[PDB]
Amino acid sequence: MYENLCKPIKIGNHLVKNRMKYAATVDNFCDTKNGNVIDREIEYLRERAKGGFGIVVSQGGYTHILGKGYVGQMGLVEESHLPGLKKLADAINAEGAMSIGQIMHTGRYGHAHEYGIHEAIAGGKTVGPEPVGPTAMSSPIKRYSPCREMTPEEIEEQIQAHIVAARMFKQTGWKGVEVCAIVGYLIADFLSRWTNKRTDKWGGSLENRARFLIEILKGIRKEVGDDYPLVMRLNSTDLIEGGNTDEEYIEIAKMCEAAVRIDLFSITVGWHESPGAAITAEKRPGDWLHLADNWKKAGIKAPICMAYRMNQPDVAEKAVAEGRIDIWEMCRPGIADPYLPKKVCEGRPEDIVTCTACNQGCFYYVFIDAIMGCMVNPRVGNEWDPAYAINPAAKKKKVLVVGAGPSGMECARLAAVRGHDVTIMEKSDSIGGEVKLGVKSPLLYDWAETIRYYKAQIDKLGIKLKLNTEATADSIKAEAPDVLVIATGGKPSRPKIEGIDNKIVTNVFDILEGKVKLGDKVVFIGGNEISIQTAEYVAEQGKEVTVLEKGKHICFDVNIFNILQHRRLMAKLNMKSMTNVTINEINDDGVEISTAGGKDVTIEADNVVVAEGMDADDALAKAVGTKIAPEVYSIGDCAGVRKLYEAIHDGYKMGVKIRGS
Ligand SMILES: Cc1cc2nc3c(=O)[nH]c(=O)nc-3n(C[C@H](O)[C@H](O)[C@H](O)COP(=O)(O)OP(=O)(O)OC[C@H]3O[C@@H](n4cnc5c(N)ncnc54)[C@H](O)[C@@H]3O)c2cc1C
Numbered sequence: 001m002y003e004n005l006c007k008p009i010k011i012g013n014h015l016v017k018n019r020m021k022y023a024a025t026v027d028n029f030c031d032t033k034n035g036n037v038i039d040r041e042i043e044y045l046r047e048r049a050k051g052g053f054g055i056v057v058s059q060g061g062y063t064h065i066l067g068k069g070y071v072g073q074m075g076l077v078e079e080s081h082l083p084g085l086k087k088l089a090d091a092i093n094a095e096g097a098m099s100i101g102q103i104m105h106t107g108r109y110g111h112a113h114e115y116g117i118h119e120a121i122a123g124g125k126t127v128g129p130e131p132v133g134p135t136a137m138s139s140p141i142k143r144y145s146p147c148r149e150m151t152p153e154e155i156e157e158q159i160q161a162h163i164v165a166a167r168m169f170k171q172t173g174w175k176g177v178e179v180c181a182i183v184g185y186l187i188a189d190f191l192s193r194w195t196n197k198r199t200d201k202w203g204g205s206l207e208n209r210a211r212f213l214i215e216i217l218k219g220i221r222k223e224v225g226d227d228y229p230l231v232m233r234l235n236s237t238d239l240i241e242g243g244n245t246d247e248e249y250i251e252i253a254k255m256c257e258a259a260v261r262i263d264l265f266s267i268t269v270g271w272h273e274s275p276g277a278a279i280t281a282e283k284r285p286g287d288w289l290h291l292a293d294n295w296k297k298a299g300i301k302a303p304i305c306m307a308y309r310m311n312q313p314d315v316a317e318k319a320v321a322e323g324r325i326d327i328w329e330m331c332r333p334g335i336a337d338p339y340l341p342k343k344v345c346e347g348r349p350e351d352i353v354t355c356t357a358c359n360q361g362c363f364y365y366v367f368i369d370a371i372m373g374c375m376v377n378p379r380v381g382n383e384w385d386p387a388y389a390i391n392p393a394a395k396k397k398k399v400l401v402v403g404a405g406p407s408g409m410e411c412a413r414l415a416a417v418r419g420h421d422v423t424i425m426e427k428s429d430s431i432g433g434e435v436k437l438g439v440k441s442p443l444l445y446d447w448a449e450t451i452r453y454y455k456a457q458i459d460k461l462g463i464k465l466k467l468n469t470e471a472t473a474d475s476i477k478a479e480a481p482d483v484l485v486i487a488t489g490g491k492p493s494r495p496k497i498e499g500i501d502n503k504i505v506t507n508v509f510d511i512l513e514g515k516v517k518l519g520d521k522v523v524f525i526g527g528n529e530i531s532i533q534t535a536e537y538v539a540e541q542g543k544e545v546t547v548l549e550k551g552k553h554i555c556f557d558v559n560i561f562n563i564l565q566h567r568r569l570m571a572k573l574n575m576k577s578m579t580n581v582t583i584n585e586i587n588d589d590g591v592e593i594s595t596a597g598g599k600d601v602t603i604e605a606d607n608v609v610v611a612e613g614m615d616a617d618d619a620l621a622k623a624v625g626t627k628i629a630p631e632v633y634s635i636g637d638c639a640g641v642r643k644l645y646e647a648i649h650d651g652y653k654m655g656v657k658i659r660g661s
């Protein structure tokens with residue numbers, strides 16, 4: 001089935017068992033106090049190595065405290081870092097994966113001041129804790145504080161710190177070393193003409209901008225020797241106006257190859273300061289592969305690997321078969337499913353837990369200096385935790401799950417995996433719940449992969465799925481289970497609005513279930529994520545859509561990474577929006593609003609969608625109580641409205657805790 005993905009490859013002298021690479025992932029799992037590798041990190045990367053990845057890259061480790069850009073970033077500075085690095089490499093290597101250590105000083109994106117650092121020694125001098133760059137400047141992004149200009153001595157010291165970092169990985173058993181020269185971190189800052197305004201030998205011409213990187217590579221190569229795998233990450237496109245051209249990145253890569261033997265090029269898209277789309281659901285698998293083509297026709301000798309929304313085995317298989325890339329590189333697909341390569345090579349892609357590019361647990365949690373998580377994978381950051389271990393139940397119990405939404409299905413899946421006799425009762429004709437409604441939204445197309453995954457799991461695990469079956473007190477009693485799991489989800493709220501009883505008033509459920517005929521003008525009351533995604537579905541159909549929000553902002557519950565994605569779509573679909581509006585009443589011809597400035601305006605509508613929020617659909621739970629079965633639990637939105645991340649996590653936690661005694 002995936003002959004090309006499962007084909008081996010030589011990276012330097014090292015034979016890699018397949019063409020699947022798990023990319024560097026800072027996750028805030030290392031010791032926040034000192035940058036040491038701890039059990040949370042070890043077990044996280046061990047799961048990717050057990051999952052079958054031919055290559056497993058560590059997260060980018062800082063080379064100096066000023067280069068620390070994440071609260072729990074791994075450190076590559078002191079002798080006290082060595083024991084942890086050895087444990088990490090042992091764990092990856094034992095599984096048969098090629099361990100690769102990444103070196104990443106975050107430069108302009110450093111946040112040492114936020115990590116209890118009040119001063120540091122840099123270039124033999126006492127300095128403040130501010131980020132460093134080739135040129136003293138500010139960021140368009142408020143998360144990044146103004147940087148200080150590195151002295152030539154600090155530059156020389158950082159080259160040596162990179163050599164020492166590579167020495168540290170090699171002495172602790174890592175199979176190779178990766179230089180992170182991307183996305184706006186220190187090296188990328190010297191490479192880009194946007195960040196590098198130096199007039200000495202470290203800036204000006206492209207040759208000078210590349211010097212810091214070249215000297216780092218030359219130094220590492222001399223340190224580790226000729227036989228040791230030296231790989232690197234470099235941008236193919238920075239998506240920065242006034243940055244380097246795509247062709248300049250190729251010239252830099254050519255300078256790299258001429259300086260040292262590069263054993264693998266990982267090619268990347270954008271900077272953290274880039275406004276445009278790079279990693280979102282706006283980009284589909286293969287949307288960036290033309291860049292890999294240009295590197296190949298430019299004559300780059302080293303094998304190439306590429307990630308960046310490559311979440312499909314079929315797309316990667318073709319890309320590798322056609323020689324566009326030599327290795328399928330991935331980060332978020334490996335967060336979502338650490339066993340993706342094992343599934344690809346055993347010919348079961350239907351078992352893949354696909355990353356939907358939600359950017360919640362991964363990007364967003366890491367950037368707000370929180371412990372990384374994953375929406376679709378509740379095990380992320382918990383592989384090391386005994387409370388998340390999946391253990392066979394000795395005494396099989398009869399488990400009745402009410403509701404085939406994500407929380408119900410994840411619970412049923414885990415309870416069946418552990419050996420319980422599981423039944424799902426679902427009132428509609430199909431599984432998915434609100435995920436089955438959301439999949440209709442333009443940016444939620446990868447939610448069909450979540451449906452496909454759970455549909456295939458129910459089948460394989462022998463879960464008794466009872467579709468078109470509304471669970472009642474009587475049908476639960478007839479079933480007589482040992483454990484009743486209520487996972488009936490949420491329902492649209494009914495706020496106290498004048499004229500809410502109008503015929504014009506509908507809800508997000510009736511829209512997505514096709515239970516309402518919509519006109520040419522559709523007006524949404526509510527500016528939350530659910531209201532916006534439904535409005536995008538209504539607008540895609542070529543309808544005139546207005547979103548009215550009483551609060552200060554629309555998309556208020558949408559993480560920073562998805563905000564711009566929604567702006568682009570709303571503009572593209574000619575969607576109108578109003579904020580700080582008072583909803584006065586709903587009537588026959590639309591909705592009467594009063595702006596924050598005092599303007600009374602009539603919003604013309606053929607349909608009024610009241611989408612201010614969701615209530616817990618807890619009628620069944622209130623009707624049956626806690627005594628209808630020996631064990632009664634409520635999970636997901638029926639236990640209190642949260643979102644998809646919490647529903648899936650509640651399901652996993654419910655599924656693992658169902659005891660056998
Ligand atoms: C259009 C849309 C877009 C969304 N977008 C996002 C997003 O981007 N990110 C995010 O975090 N969240 C989003 N959400 C919310 C998210 O989908 C929900 O939080 C989540 O699906 C709730 O999971 P659940 O298992 O608790 O309930 P549900 O998904 O609501 O499932 C409940 C299930 O129980 C069934 N059922 C109900 N009563 C009975 C009964 N008595 N007997 C049998 N079956 C019954 C229902 O038919 C349904 O299948 C969105 C929701 C919608 C509708």
Ligand SMILES: Cc1cc2nc3c(=O)[nH]c(=O)nc-3n(C[C@H](O)[C@H](O)[C@H](O)COP(=O)(O)O)c2cc1C
Nearest residue numbers: 023024025026059060307308309330331332362363
């Ligand atoms: C939480 C998170 C942390 C990341 N940490 C790193 C890092 O340590 N070093 C690095 O070079 N890239 C890092 N990246 C970039 C990824 O390795 C990857 O190239 C990117 O997410 C695009 O690939 P994908 O679509 O497979 O996720 C990070 C990405 C995420 C989601």
Ligand code: SF4
Nearest residue numbers: 355357358359362374
């Ligand atoms: S949190 Fe969302 S984007 Fe990140 S790995 Fe999980 S499914 Fe993918």
